[PDB]
Amino acid sequence: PAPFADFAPPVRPQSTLRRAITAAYRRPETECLPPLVEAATQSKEIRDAAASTARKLIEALRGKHSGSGVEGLVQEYSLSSQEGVALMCLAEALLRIPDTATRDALIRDKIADGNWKSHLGGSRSLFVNAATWGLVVTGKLTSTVNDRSLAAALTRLISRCGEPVIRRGVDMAMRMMGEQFVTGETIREALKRSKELEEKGFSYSYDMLGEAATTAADAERYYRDYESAIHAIGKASAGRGIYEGPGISIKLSALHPRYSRAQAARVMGELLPRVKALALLAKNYDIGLNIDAEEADRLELSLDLLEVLCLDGDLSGWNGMGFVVQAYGKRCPFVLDFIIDLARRSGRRIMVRLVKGAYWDAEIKRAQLDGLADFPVFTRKIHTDVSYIACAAKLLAATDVVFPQFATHNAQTLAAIYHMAGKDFHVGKYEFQCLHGMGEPLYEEVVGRGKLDRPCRIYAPVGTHETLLAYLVRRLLENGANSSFVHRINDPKVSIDELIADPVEVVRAMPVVGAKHDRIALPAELFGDARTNSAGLDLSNEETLASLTEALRESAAMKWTALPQLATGPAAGETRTVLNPGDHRDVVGSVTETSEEDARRAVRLAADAAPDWAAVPPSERAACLDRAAELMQARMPTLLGLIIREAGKSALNAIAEVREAIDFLRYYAEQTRRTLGPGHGPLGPIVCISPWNFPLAIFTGQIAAALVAGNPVLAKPAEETPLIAAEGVRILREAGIPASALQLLPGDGRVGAALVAAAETAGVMFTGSTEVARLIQAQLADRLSPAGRPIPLIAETGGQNAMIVDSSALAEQVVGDVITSAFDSAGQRCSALRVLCLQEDVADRILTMLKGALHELHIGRTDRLSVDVGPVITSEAKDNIEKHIERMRGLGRKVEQIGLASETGVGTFVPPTIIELEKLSDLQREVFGPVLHVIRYRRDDLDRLVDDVNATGYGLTFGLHTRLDETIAHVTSRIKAGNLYINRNIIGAVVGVQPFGGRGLSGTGPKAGGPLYLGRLVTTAPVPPQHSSVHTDPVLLDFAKWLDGKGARAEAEAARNAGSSSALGLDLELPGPVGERNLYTLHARGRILLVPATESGLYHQLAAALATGNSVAIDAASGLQASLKNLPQTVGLRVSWSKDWAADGPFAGALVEGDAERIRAVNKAIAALPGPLLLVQAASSGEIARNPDAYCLNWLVEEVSASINTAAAGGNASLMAIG
Ligand SMILES: Cc1cc2nc3c(=O)[nH]c(=O)nc-3n(C[C@H](O)[C@H](O)[C@H](O)COP(=O)(O)OP(=O)(O)OC[C@H]3O[C@@H](n4cnc5c(N)ncnc54)[C@H](O)[C@@H]3O)c2cc1C
Ligand SMILES: N[C@@H](CCC(=O)O)C(=O)O
């Protein structure tokens, strides 16, 4: 099959109307607003009449408004906010007891008289949904639950007020969850309760609350639920028709687990027939069937379903098909043009529900994460209001061919449209709509001859407690944010004049019409003045898909090559082809590999050229990196094609990798501009050995850092992926890196070994396996710099990454993050999820959902957008992974695998696999493939489990899914890993936002994409930006006092200076996208091995280690035991003496004192220690006397990155204030 010939063909050729939609997707806000203002303009007379009507409605709303039930309960029992939240959580839990008499007995006999804890909230915290009840009680969203505060509050309120307050809480929650948040628990109950307002002139559309199917079984459940509801609604409608009678609303995401543009062929083949069958049933009963609008990247896909349905002759004669359009979206007027034309062509009077939109804060976050040009929604609330009124004018001009349905709770919006529609009205011309239990106060001033005599359809949620709680936060934020009408009308500090303000005239009078909100960053400006964010590509945009298709095809027609590019020019060598891992018939290019002799020559040439590159000023070296970033951004589509075909990656992952390469270049450039001066001299020639799994990004990151720190580079790319490396070198050279400063040496591991062994090699940057890093460490321990000090090694070496999930996590969120973390990139990320740990009480349900989601993945050659998982890199990798799977299977462990299509046979594929283990110790080696292991744990054994995760010795990435603050605090304080992720996936660390790198068996540090990286690549490290701490280690202070008491005044002063200079305790938040908090902290590394030679050297080593929070093991062969007598117990607790260093590890670093040959000997003994590669610092006794910084404190602390998804509860609290 020709490369990319079937990458992403659209469902149908795009008409002129469809292209106008796509053209507006991310149109600048200043371009969108002027035509909306023009379309929304009304005469002065109408505006005065509309303001008068709006004032009348608002005066009625404020005149009949009473205090809510929850407020009256809080008042009656003098509850604090936390007590109110806790009470509603208890009431929710008591309502999970189905039998009434049993529940009432538990309240009277167990709950009221004392400890609620012994009787409820065991496997499941009482407070799982406290973020939701927090919104109900306080109006404020808090993303995680302080379950210790709520437990204290519940104990306090029960001990104070007893059974009467529990009774009132239960009755209140019963009413709210059975009658307010839903019209009824079941469609039959909802229908029964609908007759009252139908007799007053309201109508209904029932919302069955399903969305976001994760498995085929979920989708089938939502389908049969919609089918049964249509029968009930149609029986009840009893021939009333689509305007007077009730209808149903559906969400397409409920009806297929892979509802996305990437899976468009499956959507049209599998989802469409299901909608058609439901529509045929709605037709037979003559009821409305409305398609709800969801995320912006589903809008245009949903239009293809609407088109086919409206043109399908089997549905003719029925006008009940309906469709939502969101006015906060920039495409809205163009979507309406398309729908109105479709209604004309089909002869169907499409029911068009105009809404503002329910996903605003999620759309802001997604555009920022994806680095896109602009948002697909407005960023000022008043812009959405003008858009709404402009689109209403368009709909009101077309009431002969569509049925407009104006869904809004805003009385100003309502009044404007009521007067815009004019005097002639009949039922069927248009209607308003509102939400059950929210809009009735307003629309009881609208419906009926005694009011405005306009009808209103009530959108009526129907479902159980579990179903309604799933996305209730999103629903509450619709009317509960600071800019929301409903919130403002309940604000006594908001005047009626402010509420009837005309958005159209206010926008017109702004100095810059349509300006972006001042407090929302465009994705390109996420980092402000520090650096320019890389830009991505929108794979839901048909223009982008069409242009990418052509650029990818053109990339496959190119003759890609990689050569040994020495300072003197290209070199000759053995030449072989490079094959596509997904199809070995696809020759991607040719590589000429380096001889060991030319590798040694290249190091000599780099040493010769080192002074000339060091002499380029840091600002100009940084300018080279910035130029290279511009070139990679411009070349991204071609680079994507090469990464897809050479490395076996999906287009989605290739985009993210090119972004990361750009980000490394710009980040290390900025860090250079912040730090490097004449005193930060380069190490010398640096050997950069890069992996095949990130063959552009990690390749570029290591090289850019070394180059910009002033070092010439020997770049040794992975044997499997030389072509993208050669292209990266071409770009850096074009950007101004001299050929003598950057030499490319393709080949296997003996090229890397020859480079590492060369006498002029001054440092090594390695990313790859622990075994190979260990062999490199042994090579380097043979050598010293010309100054007689160890050759620095930065080695990043993988992990055995775990995710812990408790019973408070939302299963659908968990499963999405697990599927991504374990199987993205065929599990070939060092960050990938390897062990999922499920709390026993929820393990079976989550495992069922996970296996169902597994079988929805598409595996194949990655030149198709529909492929989720590509090949593994080689046949040897495939064989290694499959041997592990079969060993587990042979031991009797449950193995789940997806079936592979026959087309995979021409490449090297491993199917995504789930293996159920009894305990974590059952997994003994790192399996670098799409293989997820699952274990279960009892909640009381959580702390032991964290110990088990730490006990492996790895410490790279780690995930935690929980809503509970006590569990977050416990787990994050006890886990020892470099990159922590809370309520999100554990992959795709972002440069400068989640600096990446771990500890123990996972690496030496410093973190890539972090502020300590460049300092390792110069002889004297600079002070990184923001790198300081006001905290002083108390054991350091006790040691300094002990030194003073022994009379060692000089060393006591040096100890106090180390205490001040240490950055232990640094605690920063890094700028990033909204809806996420990204934290960066400095901790102690662990136990540092001290190898002293003199008394003063030992005191200096101890001061450095203690100032950075570490414990120490001191070499007993030093003979210096008598120098450390009578230590304070606080210091003694941190001090041990070691005769057998191998028995007393693992260590987290080392400090060595001695002459050059002593240092070399100790360096070899340290390399021989089993376990982690130690970051070793050495100094002579004279150097310790002369240089207070002989041992650099930068390398005695451990960096930790933590990324918290603060939108995980369903919305963004910070953005509730942005309008
Ligand atoms: C009957 C009915 C059916 C609905 N069905 C859907 C649906 O299928 N899909 C869907 O997405 N929504 C749907 N909604 C929700 C709806 O879109 C609104 O979120 C909600 O009703 C609030 O809008 P409002 O006009 O009633 O109030 P208003 O308070 O006047 O408006 C609030 C809205 O303003 C917008 N907004 C807030 N801040 C900003 C900002 N900084 N920049 C730009 N815009 C901003 C948001 O859209 C927000 O919801 C429906 C609402 C109703 C009444
Ligand atoms: N930085 C990558 C992993 C890099 C690697 O695999 O070595 C991530 O966070 O997904």
Residue numbers in the entry: 15 to 1233
Reproduce, without paraphrasing, sentences from the article in which this PDB structure was first reported.
The bifunctional enzyme proline utilization A (PutA) catalyzes the two-step oxidation of L-proline to L-glutamate using proline dehydrogenase (PRODH) and L-glutamate-γ-semialdehyde dehydrogenase (GSALDH) domains.
The structure of SmPutA complexed with the product L-glutamate was determined at 1.50 Å resolution. The complex was prepared by soaking WT crystals with 325 mM L-glutamate. Cys844 in this complex exhibits χ1 of −69°, instead of the nucleophilic attack rotamer (55°), to avoid steric clash with the side chain carboxylate of the product. The interactions of the product are similar to those of GSAL in the noncovalent complex and the acyl-enzyme intermediate. Conformational differences in the FAD are also evident and imply a crankshaft rotation of the ribityl chain upon proline binding to the resting enzyme.
